[PDB]
Amino acid sequence: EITRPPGVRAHVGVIGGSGLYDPGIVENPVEVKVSTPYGNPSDFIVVGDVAGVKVAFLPRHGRGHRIPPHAINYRANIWALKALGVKWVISVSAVGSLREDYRPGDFVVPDQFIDMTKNRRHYTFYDGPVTVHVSMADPFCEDLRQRLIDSGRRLGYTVHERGTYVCIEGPRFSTRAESRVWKDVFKADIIGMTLVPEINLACEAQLCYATLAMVTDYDVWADRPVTAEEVERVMISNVERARRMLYDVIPKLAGEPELERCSCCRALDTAAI
Amino acid sequence: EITRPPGVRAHVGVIGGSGLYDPGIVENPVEVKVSTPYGNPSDFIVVGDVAGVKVAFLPRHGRGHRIPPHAINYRANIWALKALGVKWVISVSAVGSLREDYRPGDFVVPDQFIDMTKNRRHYTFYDGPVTVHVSMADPFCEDLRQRLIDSGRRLGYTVHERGTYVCIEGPRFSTRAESRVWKDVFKADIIGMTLVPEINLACEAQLCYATLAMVTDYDVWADRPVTAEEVERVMISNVERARRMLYDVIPKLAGEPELERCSCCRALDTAAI
Amino acid sequence: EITRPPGVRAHVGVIGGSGLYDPGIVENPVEVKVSTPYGNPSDFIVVGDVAGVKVAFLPRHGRGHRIPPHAINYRANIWALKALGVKWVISVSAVGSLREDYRPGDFVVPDQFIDMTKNRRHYTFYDGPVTVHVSMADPFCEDLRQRLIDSGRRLGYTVHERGTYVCIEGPRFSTRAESRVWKDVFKADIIGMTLVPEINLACEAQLCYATLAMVTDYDVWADRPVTAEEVERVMISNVERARRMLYDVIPKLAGEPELERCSCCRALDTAAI
Numbered sequence: 090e091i092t093r094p095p096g097v098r099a100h101v102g103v104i105g106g107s108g109l110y111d112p113g114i115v116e117n118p119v120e121v122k123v124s125t126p127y128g129n130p131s132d133f134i135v136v137g138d139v140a141g142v143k144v145a146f147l148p149r150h151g152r153g154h155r156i157p158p159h160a161i162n163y164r165a166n167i168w169a170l171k172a173l174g175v176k177w178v179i180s181v182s183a184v185g186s187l188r189e190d191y192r193p194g195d196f197v198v199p200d201q202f203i204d205m206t207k208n209r210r211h212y213t214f215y216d217g218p219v220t221v222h223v224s225m226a227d228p229f230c231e232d233l234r235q236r237l238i239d240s241g242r243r244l245g246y247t248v249h250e251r252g253t254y255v256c257i258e259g260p261r262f263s264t265r266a267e268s269r270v271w272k273d274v275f276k277a278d279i280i281g282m283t284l285v286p287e288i289n290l291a292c293e294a295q296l297c298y299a300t301l302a303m304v305t306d307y308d309v310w311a312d313r314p315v316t317a318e319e320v321e322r323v324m325i326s327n328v329e330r331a332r333r334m335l336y337d338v339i340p341k342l343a344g345e346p347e348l349e350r351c352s353c354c355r356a357l358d359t360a361a362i
Numbered sequence: 363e364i365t366r367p368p369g370v371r372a373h374v375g376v377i378g379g380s381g382l383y384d385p386g387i388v389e390n391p392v393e394v395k396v397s398t399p400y401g402n403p404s405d406f407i408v409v410g411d412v413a414g415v416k417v418a419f420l421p422r423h424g425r426g427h428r429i430p431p432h433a434i435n436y437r438a439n440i441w442a443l444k445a446l447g448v449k450w451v452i453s454v455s456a457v458g459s460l461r462e463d464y465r466p467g468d469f470v471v472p473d474q475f476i477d478m479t480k481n482r483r484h485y486t487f488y489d490g491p492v493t494v495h496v497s498m499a500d501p502f503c504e505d506l507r508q509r510l511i512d513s514g515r516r517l518g519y520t521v522h523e524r525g526t527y528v529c530i531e532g533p534r535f536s537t538r539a540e541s542r543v544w545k546d547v548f549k550a551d552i553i554g555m556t557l558v559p560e561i562n563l564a565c566e567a568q569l570c571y572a573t574l575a576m577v578t579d580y581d582v583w584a585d586r587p588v589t590a591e592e593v594e595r596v597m598i599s600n601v602e603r604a605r606r607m608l609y610d611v612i613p614k615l616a617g618e619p620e621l622e623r624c625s626c627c628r629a630l631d632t633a634a635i
Numbered sequence: 636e637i638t639r640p641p642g643v644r645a646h647v648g649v650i651g652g653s654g655l656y657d658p659g660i661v662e663n664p665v666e667v668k669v670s671t672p673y674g675n676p677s678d679f680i681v682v683g684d685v686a687g688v689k690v691a692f693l694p695r696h697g698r699g700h701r702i703p704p705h706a707i708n709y710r711a712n713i714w715a716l717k718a719l720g721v722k723w724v725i726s727v728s729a730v731g732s733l734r735e736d737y738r739p740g741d742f743v744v745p746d747q748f749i750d751m752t753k754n755r756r757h758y759t760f761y762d763g764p765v766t767v768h769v770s771m772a773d774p775f776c777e778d779l780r781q782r783l784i785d786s787g788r789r790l791g792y793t794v795h796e797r798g799t800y801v802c803i804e805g806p807r808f809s810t811r812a813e814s815r816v817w818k819d820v821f822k823a824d825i826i827g828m829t830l831v832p833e834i835n836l837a838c839e840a841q842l843c844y845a846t847l848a849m850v851t852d853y854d855v856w857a858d859r860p861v862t863a864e865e866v867e868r869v870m871i872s873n874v875e876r877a878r879r880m881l882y883d884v885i886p887k888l889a890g891e892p893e894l895e896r897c898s899c900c901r902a903l904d905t906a907a908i
């Protein structure tokens with residue numbers, strides 16, 4: 090509603106690490122405060138120009154990785170992006186792999202998820218009196234998934250074109266017994282902590298949201314189990330490739346998502362009672 | 363404790379949609395406010411006579427479907443019914459089907475459930491200093507299940523006599539990956555959002571509770587995934603059949619549940635420490 | 636930080652029932668209040684000497700079993716033990732069995748767990764600005780597990796040397812449909828309510844924690860389902876054997892845990908961002 094500075098708008102939102110913003114590319118960056126009914130987003134939003142497209146960058150963990158997955162104000166974050174006018178949301182996330190062929194350093198563009206979170210407090214924007222039940226059979230925006238996959242291929246990177254993400258509560262990593270359940274029983278492909286309720290909220294806000302996941306580790310299945318320092322190290326080693334993909338895709342998002350390939354773009358038409 | 367008007371009592375409680383109350387049948391309806399230690403129930407309770415049996419009707423979502431499943435004051439709702447003296451609780455619920463033979467428009471009287479909720483805040487009435495752990499191996503009241511099945515058969519409706527209900531958090535519907543887990547891995551039959559913690563609380567209150575579920579949709583498994591508007595439409599089309607069953611069963615509930623076919627009727631004898 | 640009386644320290648913590656403290660063994664017991672940033676622990680901590688080793692005893696449910704599993708202040712409890720200087724934590728817990736060969740009266744020293752809790756509110760000590768993700772692939776302290784198994788064998792008791800614990804929310808016990816999932820789908824061995832988030836927090840605090848579980852019942856799988864009164868009765872019948880094991884093991888804990896057999900002893904080195 091109120092922004093400071095006033096009158097700022099953007100077309101594409103990027104949620105992820107602070108390292109994705111590059112001041113050498115983004116023209117006329119401005120730090121923006123956006124009012125939300127839920128209080129503070131994770132940090133200031135940075136708005137600037139990439140090849141003529143206005144982009145809003147939000148670090149989900151805050152600058153300096155100050156906010157763990159369970160403590161993020163997911164409602165404020167998605168509200169703020171929607172208030173700025175964005176239509177496309179690219180989420181960039183680190184994930185663990187549950188399969189030998191999805192290797193550290195590969196990208197995955199997932200198509201499904203399983204929510205095993207417990208403690209996120211709000212899974213919706215709609216607490217009444219209008220009851221809203223969005224259909225999430227196909228929860229990601231296909232228009233954007235396909236654009237991410239094409240970019241990655243054109244740049245020569247490995248991009249797995251499907252994947253089921255199991256979202257766990259954390260902040261601790263899985264036990265071996267849990268990981269066996271995710272991999273052998275649920276048949277999930279990748280594991281992370283931040284997708285839910287971010288994706289739920291993006292869908293309710295009628296955004297075209299997709300995830301670009303970067304595999305950082307093999308969970309408990311290698312010689313050494315995952316540690317936080319390994320995730321950060323691998324991520325920082327490869328953020329350059331994620332940046333190159335982002336600066337390739339964003340100019341192609343000057344237009345609107347195609348309704349027939351955006352499951353959430355008109356979610357509220359059929360969802361509200 | 364305090365009611366307004368004072369001195370109101372009832373024998374049978376019905377929890378479900380507002381459309382189930384029929385002013386053409388119910389004699390001498392009175393809207394009742396019932397004090398609870400947990401604040402407001404979903405709405406006023408309507409108490410009236412059906413063929414000489416006193417019935418209390420509570421719309422779980424409130425009149426006008428104002429309260430989504432995660433925001434319902436389950437403790438207040440079950441406390442209020444217990445305070446009015448009810449022994450039998452018929453819950454009427456819309457569910458999705460995970461099996462081709464449980465079709466839209468069929469009734470199901472489930473016998474088991476799996477709780478996959480996350481965000482309901484209170485799963486019990488007993489937070490100490492008396493610790494209570496009720497046994498819920500057979501969580502529904504068999505005496506009432508059998509009466510519902512008999513009514514449905516006598517009226518010529520399809521009533522499936524068993525079923526495992528998976529209760530999910532919502533308000534969003536399942537992904538395809540989640541639905542595959544419910545159906546293929548957990549082997550659940552029907553899916554809904556409101557059973558838990560309603561059933562837990564009913565058991566702790568020593569009520570004979572059973573669910574009459576109406577199948578409204580096939581979840582993600584048809585040509586088109588479930589939407590909220592489809593659920594409401596199918597429900598409203600068939601509420602007439604649910605009403606006919608209710609007005610058939612209620613006169614037969616003039617007596618008491620049989621202890622040997624009411625697993626929760628003496629739950630607290632063995633549950634309290 | 637502040638203790639009353641001041642200057643109290645201990646080396647070994649025991650978490651479990653009040654019946655484990657034996658005033659005939661423990662020399663110079665003192666009831667201690669320990670300040671925590673999270674408010675009150677379950678009860679006073681009792682500190683005393685067992686064969687020259689200083690031991691702190693905390694009843695997790697409080698004296699008189701006043702606090703059910705979902706209402707325990709897990710953060711306060713583990714903070715208080717850490718503030719007293721303890722290095723070893725022996726948790727004693729009642730569990731249900733999901734397998735015929737783990738019989739009522741047997742001990743189990745589990746090696747894995749699966750968290751199916753929902754409502755414990757805090758799963759970590761670290762809410763930012765330092766984000767901490769501890770690795771819990773092998774979540775129990777092996778040094779202590781092996782010492783418990785050896786004690787039990789030397790005293791002639793049955794001690795199962797492995798086991799996956801599924802931790803459920805409660806306070807109600809499982810349905811038959813849920814229990815089938817735990818046993819047949821997840822392949823868990825034992826079931827209980829109190830392990831999580833106690834173990835998470837112990838790991839973050841760099842404690843060597845292990846569970847000595849006592850099987851009290853077969854969940855829903857016997858002729859009669861588990862009840863609370865059966866759990867208490869079986870527990871109290873066998874607490875004498877648990878006491879004998881504790882007074883055998885504690886003198887052997889005069890030293891420090893071996894780092895190579897203590898997965899959490901240096902958890903924070905690699906976990907903090």
Ligand SMILES: Nc1ncnc2[nH]cnc12
Nearest residue numbers: 183184185280281282308
């Ligand atoms: N193995 C893993 N589990 C959960 N979240 C992760 N993020 C990165 N790697 C992960």
Ligand SMILES: Nc1ncnc2[nH]cnc12
Nearest residue numbers: 456457458553554555581
């Ligand atoms: N498919 C479905 N999933 C969950 N709750 C429902 N209620 C009605 N249909 C449902």
Ligand SMILES: Nc1ncnc2[nH]cnc12
Nearest residue numbers: 729730731826827828854
């Ligand atoms: N069957 C059971 N389920 C859960 N917690 C328990 N504690 C003891 N027996 C149990």
